[PDB]
Amino acid sequence: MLLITPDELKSYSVFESVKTRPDELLKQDILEATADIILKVGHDFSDAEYIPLPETVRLALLKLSQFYALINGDESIIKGYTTEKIGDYSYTLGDGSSLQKPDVYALIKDYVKPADPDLEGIEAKVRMRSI
């Protein structure tokens, strides 16, 4: 599971909403952000033997997290009065903009489910882990 500090988000995010947001929440939000990335790549970094944190993901999550956290604790942005945090055409800004998710697809596009066969280093680890 994503392991990015909530403070680090505010560190890069110069948003009061993101700043105000408590770490306790920032966590839930951050995780909620990864849920998207994880869905985008259709993979969840669980295996401790495969939990990379490139500038792309970190940035992708930082942006996503910054986006949501931004439309999370703001003035009085509209949102599913009886719904949860999503990524629709909601989050009406004070100006009247449909602030939607950011563009980090290209960021994860680097770590997006590629089109590779089962040629990857398989039957190698096991062969060893077995020994």
Curated annotation (Swiss-Prot):
InterPro entries: DUF3199_YqbG, YqbG-like_sf. It comes from the Bacteria. Coiled coil: none annotated. Monomer. This is Uncharacterized protein YqbG. It comes from Bacillus subtilis (strain 168).
